Every structure is written in structure tokens, then in C-alpha cells.
Design a protein around this ligand. Sequence first.
Ligand code: PLP
Ligand code: PLP
Lengths: 456, 417
Amino acid sequence: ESGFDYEGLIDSELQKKRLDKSYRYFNNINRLAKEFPDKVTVWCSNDYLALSKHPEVLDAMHKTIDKYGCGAGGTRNHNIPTLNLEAELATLHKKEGALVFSSCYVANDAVLSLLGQKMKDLVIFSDELNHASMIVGIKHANVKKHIFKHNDLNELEQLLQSYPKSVPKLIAFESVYSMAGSVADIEKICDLADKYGALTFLDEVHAVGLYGPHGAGVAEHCDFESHRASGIATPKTNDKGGAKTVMDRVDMITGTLGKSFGSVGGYVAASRKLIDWFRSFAPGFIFTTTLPPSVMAGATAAIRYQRCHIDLRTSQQKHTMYVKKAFHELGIPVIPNPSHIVPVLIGNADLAKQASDILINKHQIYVQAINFPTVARGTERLRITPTPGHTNDLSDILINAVDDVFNELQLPRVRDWESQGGLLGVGESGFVEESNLWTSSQLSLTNDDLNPNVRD
Amino acid sequence: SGFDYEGLIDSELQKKRDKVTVWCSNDYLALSKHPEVLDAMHKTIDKYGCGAGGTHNIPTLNLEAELATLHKKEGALVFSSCYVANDAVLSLLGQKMKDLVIFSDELNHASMIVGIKHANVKKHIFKHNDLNELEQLLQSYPKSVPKLIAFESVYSMAGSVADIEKICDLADKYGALTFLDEVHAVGLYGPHGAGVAEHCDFESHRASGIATPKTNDKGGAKTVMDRVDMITGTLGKSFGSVGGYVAASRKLIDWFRSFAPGFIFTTTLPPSVMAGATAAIRYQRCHIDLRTSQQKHTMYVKKAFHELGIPVIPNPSHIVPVLIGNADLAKQASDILINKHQIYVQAINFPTVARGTERLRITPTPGHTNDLSDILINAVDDVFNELQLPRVRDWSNLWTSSQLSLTNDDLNPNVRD
Ligand SMILES: Cc1ncc(COP(=O)(O)O)c(C=O)c1O
Ligand SMILES: *Cc1c(COP(=O)(O)O)cnc(C)c1O
């Protein structure tokens, strides 16, 4: 008998994927190689505050390179850029400590894996729409998992209450869910954690930079006024007069440096004891090269800047609300959500892909078509993420273009969805939309309304 | 009432509870501070900014192309880190071949161990470099059972080197894929720094430059580097940046790209970091003087230590592990080296190495000229005498002198294409 047909397996797997060809034989190298390869407004981006191109960030990078070079390997003095970045992140989340990883994928995986490796009897309660990095972390934990329906805290409580209090538990969830912009009720989950003796693990990847007075995320937003008053200080009380804020109550908060903060990397912020434990025992931390000083300095600059520029957030939120209100009046079906994301429901993969195909070619607008398996078949959509940079004149070009594409491809509008009973809140007979996280009051704040200590 | 999380953590934690010459470093060729690298960074930032979020991109294609060229593979894929590359590739091979058996060298890096565990398939550990044991394990399965042999070219703590050609021979006979981590060899072995696999056909590769040669050093059809199915490396050590990669056939690369979540669900590395790595790889490929100089410095330090009876763990690589055999004395030795001689050397203890085999790790670079080496030899000799450490009595190189006499103009001009 001959060997396993490795090539046959790969070929059959690949034949299912839509991969056209870029590799060709080159006489000069006597082998195959990959053959090498405009003015477009980007309306879908993870660079939510446009900080990746901000002067303070680029300046911090250039200057750090002058001092330190490229990689961490060329430095001996943790190094100072690491301490600076960890301190900034701990400050942002008002935690005792923080730890930086290669990516938030690795952060999620390393933390969740370690909790399950050290507590074999841990039970994880996981929101059904958690990011793949959390799913993989929970899998790598090799502990029991119960999935609760998205944001269904009735179902979460039933699952939690079925166990004795003394059983170790973790509730794992995101603050903002990127594909529809839904938002967890963090305070209620913290309440449940207290009652049923659970740790909380919160992924604020799609909130950091964007929520709370200082961009510390939805957890900060839950005690908006306490945090605004205290600045970088731990407030004496929370918004309802109690001792501990929501962000204080969450055990573990993970984020990225790769989105709002205009760089790359991930982190967890937590108690000194949790951070020391991760640092001591997590192989995905221990056994990998530190991020380059320049990248860490850039992230640090972005965090410091965004903390004291609430006008970044108020600007993003106003642009979002401008786009949403316009779409509402035109009957363009946005999945209702209280966040910064504008998901336009199409409900057809071919038509969703064809819409962003026309947006790009005919209107020079980039918008991402989202299909299965990212979302459910039937719920396909265009994802739009307004930024501080999307002024009303750019928004006006986006609204006209999208309206034009809806008419060109004859896509369903809000009232069409209604006649089918609705979908994901769109044209749903008597749906009670959540209020926007950002109130009118909060949106009228300026940088002068921040505590002066946010610059020192 | 509730579970004592804090009590568990405390218990776990309690169970573990200036101008200095750096002589231990993963920045083997000092390229993290090389002007071409810094220039490529500064220029890329001006064009692209900081993170990839604000921008495949051209920097990614350029970097992947360079790495494919380095290893003379059809393609390459860049990940966050070599840790992630190793984990993602090993995991996917196990997930897609349900009857896969992985055969793993006992001293493989933690990232490979975790990748293998995530693959969740049958696993056999063979004693370090023991190819008799490897063969016995391979022959105990039918040929038609899919297999993977996972190993490193150079092992960082003692500088031992895999017999890559013989493992490829075994792979052929027993129907196995080979997965090779060249993290501690890229930059440092072969005419172009492509690693130990390249070095196995040094003359064929030197002659052909960036081209695939039609014969190998012993007259056969396929070079060692060509026979290895998957090669992983880092951008974070020799190449003076951050990131990892695998280089392999187009079909393997397309498959990894299509199916690996630890690729798909992470932010692309910053363009500047990729540009820097690219410049470092391009530079080092056409500067064999980097390697010949590193190797000469190493051999200079080793020969001196040999005549002084300072116990270097014998190895054919660039690493100088000085055996101490006591954790307290090993830590105290590098403590005196730093305070009294302004020399930095890393003490290596359990669990990195076996209890009893504690050592100082020394990694000579192109920058360590003989005058600096002379300061290192005197200082180490002084510390051995101060702490009364055991010497040799108490207890060949991959680079030939032929290879060491090559200069940059002995390379094919096509290496600057
Ligand atoms: C919700 C969520 N969590 C975690 C991550 C991982 O972040 P990073 O890209 O820094 O690895 C992402 C990234 O897309 C994410 O969207
Ligand atoms: C350092 C190391 C790596 C890890 O690579 P990073 O890119 O630093 O994650 C992997 N393999 C080996 C053998 C190493 O020594």
C-alpha cells in the first residue's frame, strides 16, 4: 500500500473554495511564485477614530524607532515602552494592571485557556454570538460550556441558578457585537455574577475608544458621570451612589490595539493578582516575541490622545446618527442598535455582494458585504462604520449612493420587510428599540467638560 | 459561599514565589537597528501610517514573496507570530486529517507542543534527535496512515541540530509530512540565511542564488529544503522585527489561508513592521559576511573556552552554552558578569532546561569583534575562578572553513533582483 493522498485531500478541500489563480512558473527561479498586482471613500473600517494616521501616533512611532529601532529583540531595557503601554491600559480601565499580547485573539485564547486549565470544574456561560477567538479560547479551556441566546439574560440566569453557588463559573461576553451593533447589559450580568458566584470576562474590542467619557468602553459608559467627574481617578461612588462601578466589578476586560487605537496587539486588564497569574503561566504570553517598541508607543499615543478627546466620540456618534436618521427617512433597512454601527439588511448574499460591487465601482465607496458564515443565511447585510472623519458632506454622498443602489438592484426597503413580518427589528410590528448609549446630554459634552487630570 | 477564586490564584502564585555589552540576544544579526530596516519603517509609516486598520496589502505581498524566495517555496503566509503560525498550522493538520499521527521531538518549543495538543490527534514523543526511536515509532504504523514529523533545525538552549536530510528520508519511507521550525537558523545558515535546510545543499543553493537548482549537493534531483513540506520561522529574532510565517507549496499555503481561524480572525501586522522585516530579509540574503563573521566570532569564543577548560556544551551551531549545573551559581555568575564586568549573559534554569543542567547562554553576533570577545573570555574565566565553578575535567560545525572563506561576491548576482 502507498502513502496517504495528502494532495488529493487538499485539492478536494480547495475545490470548495473560490480561489482563482495567482501562482505561475518563472524560468528565472525555476519554480512557481505568486504573480504581483484608488480614490475611494472607506465607509467600513476597524480604524474607528482614524488614529492609525494621526500625527501624534506617527510622531510617537518615528521617535521610538530613532531611540529603539524596529523589533523588541534589539532592546534589553520588560522594556520601558511595554511598561508605558501597560500603565496606559490599566489607567484606561482603572484596573490594577494590564498585560499586552500579540493580538486580542491571543489575549482571549490565552486567558480563557488558562482559566479552564487551572479550574477543571469551571463552567463557562457564553453568549451565542461571541467572537470566534472567544469560542476557540473556551474550546481550548476544555471545560463545560453553556451557550445562552444572544443577550437573553433570562436564559443566562436559568443556567446559572441550576448550579450550586460554590461551583466555579465564568460568564464570557462582548460589550458591543460588531455585525449588528447589539450591546450587552453589563451591569445586569455583573449582578448575576454576584448572585451565582461567577467571574466575568468582557471583550470590549468594539467599544474601546468609542464609549464612556474617556473611551474606556461600555463598562465605563454604565457609570458615565462618575468616571467623567473623577477623570483617571477611581470615583468614590458609582452613578447610583454605591461603592463600586460596573467597570470596577468586571473581573477581566480584553481589548485590541488594532482598531480604535490605530496599531496592533491585544490586552487584558484586571487585578494585579490575575495579571501576575497570566504573566506567570500563560504560554501564549511567555513564549512569544514582545511587540516592537514603535508599535507600542504608537498605541500608547493613540490611547492618551483619545482619552482626552471626547469630541472623537461625540463626532462619531453624531455622524452615525446622521446616517441612521437619513436611512430611516428613506426606508433603508438598518438593523436597529444603540451603537456606532450601521448594518444595512439585504437578506441575499448575491445581492449584498453586488451592492458593494456597485458602491465601489460606480460611487467609489467601500462598504463590506457580510454573508454566511459570518451571519445567518437570510440576514446578509452591508456593514457601515461612520468615523470622526465622515463629515455630513461625505455622509450625503454615502446616503445618495446607497439609495441609488437600492433602486438599481431593487432591494427590499423597511416596508417590504414589514410585509414579511420583520427581521432583526427591521419593520417589526411593535418593536421597542433600545435607546442609544450616547444621550443628548452626553453628546453636548466637549473636551473642557473632562477632568484636567486626563492630561496628567 | 462562592468559589474562592482569589485563594486559588494566591496558592498558584505562592508556589512560584547602562552601557553594557550584550552577549545574549535573539537579535542575532543586529538587523533590528540596521539603517535599511529603520529607513524602510520610516518610509512605510509616511505612506501607510501605524496600524493596518487604516490601510492583501502590498506590504504583506512583498513580505510573503520575500519569505517564499528565502525558502525557495511556491508561497508563504504571515501570521502575528511564529507561535501563532506553529499553533495554527499544526491545529489545522490535525483537524483535517482525523487519523493523523504526529511524531514530535521531545525538545520542541512550547508553541509546537501547544499546536500539537490543539491538533488533538495521536502523538508520539521521540527522544531528542534520536532517529532510531523515531523510525521504530514510524514503522509501527502502516504506511497509509497519515503522519507528521515535527522538529526544529536548531535547538536554542544547547545548539543541537536536527539531521533534516535523514528525517526527510524517514518521511519518504513511512509516508509522513515534515514540519520544520527554523526559528534559530534563519539568517544564520545556508549561503542566503535560509536556514539549516538550505545549508544541507549549500553549494547547490549558492550556485543557483534565488533560483531552485536542478540538482542537489550529492547529485540527486531534489534539495533538502525542497523536500521539507512546511517551514516556519519568526520575523522576531534574526530578522529584527515581529511576526511569523510558514513557507510551503501553493496548495498548502492556499489551504492554510482558507481554513485557519488564527489567521482570519486577527488584525494584519502594521505595514511598517512588515516593510522592516522585508528589508532585513533582503539585506541578510545578500550579505553572507553576516554569517561568516558570526560563526568566526563563535568559534573564537569556543576555542578560547576550550583551552581554558570552560565547559561549553558541544554543538555545531552559533550558540555557546556554558554549563554551570547549579541554578543559584548560574544566576550568581551572570549577576557578577553584569555588575563587575558590564557583560549581559542569560542564566538558564529549570523549567527551561533540566535541573542539574543549568547554564549561561551566550550568542556571539557579527558585532562581537575579537577585542570584545577577549573581554568576555577574561570576565567569564574570572567568574569561574571567583565562584570556583566546575571545569571540563570535573564533568563538527555546520559551517566548514571552505564555506567560511566565502564573501558577498561569491553569491549569484540574482540575489539582488
Ligand atoms: C470581538 C473581537 N474580539 C477579539 C478580536 C481579536 O482582536 P485582534 O485583531 O487584536 O486580534 C477581534 C478582532 O477582530 C474582535 O472583533
Ligand atoms: C522564539 C521561538 C518561537 C516563537 O516565535 P515568535 O514569533 O516569537 O512567537 C518559535 N519557535 C522557536 C523554536 C522559538 O525559539
